[PDB]
Ligand binder design. Structure first.
Ligand SMILES: [Ca+2]
Length: 501
């Protein structure tokens, strides 16, 4: 029989865990969406280019036969079929909890449609669980639908911070709408920054507040530490012993580490992704200012097995991550150029391995309170999918776009990060750079780059963009992923996006 509670729980679980030619957890909502919004950007690089479809995602040169693209497409659609099932099975129910559940499920469905809209510009549309092929709902119509959904369900959702931690409240609703309004120009051709500002303000005016220590937002106890919880509007709950190797944070932590690094937080460093030189430049405009071990200084083959030994050596050469942060004058510069794991490069002439770029240690499987985590390999770290910081950056950009003064909102975030440099005047470049500094490796980069018209164009060239070591542009039709050829062949209702063949 229909287990309403079980299905509801699964609705949320789909955001952070999975149930070939696809490794464990590869079909995950988070990993697939994260990769499509990160791997082709200036924030990071996949170290093993021999992997299928990686060169394509890395260089922005994929085709309709893209495996990675099919993965995210199939996942988004599948999740929605489940949300539709729950809604069809609870239709007519009037009890208080079910009203909240239905609103929340519609919210999650709306979020999924936003991903479709943002990534493909359209989506295989269906509102009920049936065998009928989905119909194509294009950009503007899709945009309008999502905004209507969020508007209609707001009243039945929990007030800000009143829902059980892990569930969406009215503030999550407002934030997503603010994101939609901010990107209204891209999706509909008509901007709506006035509304972006309005809804961003609703979120800022809520009970949510900014965490006083940036790093704590991405630590193992971010579901218990109030300093972090007060800012996390929508957390994707993760638990080492339960989520295990199939979660989103498994990738964020294990994927960015390699044996030898101090405080790995895991016994298994996948050494999958590292920072592109352009990412490091977001904290160091002049890359020569980045703390680095001199080429003439050798790295001992012995005496560097413990974190203590590694830290002492890094300290001697000023390359501990805490030294990186001090040099950057920004708490958010959670990068590693130390000797743990081997000699690092900031930029490379050929993507040959994990050490060809600095490591990103933003995500950690250590608790701010120092207590034990649940597992030696799989992280406990929740993914703060929605953070109050997004409201500040969204409002800043909206105000800037309208000709207003956005210094206040930008400095709210820079002050939180204890930045030595405060912004005196906001510019387009400053804004997109701040989006990177605040949200790097949180799965949204590509979307912001497209809005700023920098994803495919010459307006911004980063290392390895377009397949060129120094970066080169690509066709503008790449601002949208293609509809998987498999669905083109299976659903005659769908049409391929412009440019692809
Ligand atoms: Ca957790």
């Amino acid at each position: 029989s229909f287990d309403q509670q079980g299905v509801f729980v699964k609705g949320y679980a789909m955001l952070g865990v999975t149930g070939d030619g696809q490794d464990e957890g590869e079909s995950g909502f988070y990993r697939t969406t994260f990769n499509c919004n990160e791997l082709p950007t200036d924030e990071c690089l996949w170290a093993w280019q021999k992997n299928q479809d990686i060169p394509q995602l890395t260089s922005i040169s994929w085709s309709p036969s893209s495996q990675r693209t099919e993965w995210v497409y199939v996942r988004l659609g599948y999740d929605i079929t489940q949300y539709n099932f729950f809604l069809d099975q609870t239709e007519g129910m009037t009890d208080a909890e079910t009203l909240r559940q239905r609103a929340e499920i519609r919210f999650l469905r709306a979020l999924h449609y936003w991903y479709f809209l943002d990534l493909f510009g359209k989506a295989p549309f269906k509102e009920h669980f049936s065998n009928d092929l989905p119909v194509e709902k294009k950009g503007t119509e899709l945009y309008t639908y999502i905004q209507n959904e969020l508007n209609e369900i707001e009243a039945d959702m929990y007030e800000p911070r009143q829902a059980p931690f892990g569930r969406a409240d009215k503030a999550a609703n407002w934030l997503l709408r603010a994101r939609l309004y901010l990107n209204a120009g891209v999706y509909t051709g008509q901007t709506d920054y006035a509304k972006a500002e309005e809804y961003a303000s609703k979120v800022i005016g809520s009970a949510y507040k900014l965490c006083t220590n940036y790093s704590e937002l991405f630590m193992a106890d971010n579901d218990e530490n109030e300093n972090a919880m007060q800012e996390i509007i929508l957390p994707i709950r993760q638990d080492g012993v339960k989520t295990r190797n199939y979660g989103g944070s498994t990738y964020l932590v294990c994927g960015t580490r390699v044996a030898g690094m101090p405080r790995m937080g895991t016994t298994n460093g996948w050494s999958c992704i590292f920072a592109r030189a352009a990412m490091v430049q977001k904290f160091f405009s002049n890359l020569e200012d980045v703390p680095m071990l001199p080429a003439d200084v050798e790295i001992p083959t012995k005496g560097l097995d413990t974190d203590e030994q590694i830290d002492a050596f890094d300290a001697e050469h000023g390359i501990r991550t805490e030294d990186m942060i001090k040099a950057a004058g920004d708490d958010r510069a959670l990068l590693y150029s130390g000797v743990g794991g081997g000699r690092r490069k900031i930029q490379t002439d050929a993507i040959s391995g994990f050490t060809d770029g600095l490591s990103i240690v933003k995500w950690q499987n250590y608790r701010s309170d120092g207590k034990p985590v649940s597992h030696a390999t799989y992280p406990d770290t929740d993914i703060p999918l929605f953070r109050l910081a997004e409201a500040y950056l969204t409002r800043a950009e909206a105000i800037f776009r309208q000709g207003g003064d956005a210094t206040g909102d930008i400095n709210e975030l820079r002050k939180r990060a204890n930045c030595t440099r405060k912004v005196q005047t906001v510019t387009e470049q400053e804004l997109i750079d701040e989006w990177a500094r605040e949200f790097y490796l949180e799965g949204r980069r590509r979307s912001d780059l497209v809005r700023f018209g920098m994803f495919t164009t010459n307006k911004y060239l980063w290392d390895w963009k377009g397949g060129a070591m120094n970066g080169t542009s690509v066709a503008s039709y790449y601002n949208k992923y293609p509809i998987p050829v498999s669905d083109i062949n299976n659903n005659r209702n769908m049409s391929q996006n412009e440019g692809y063949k």
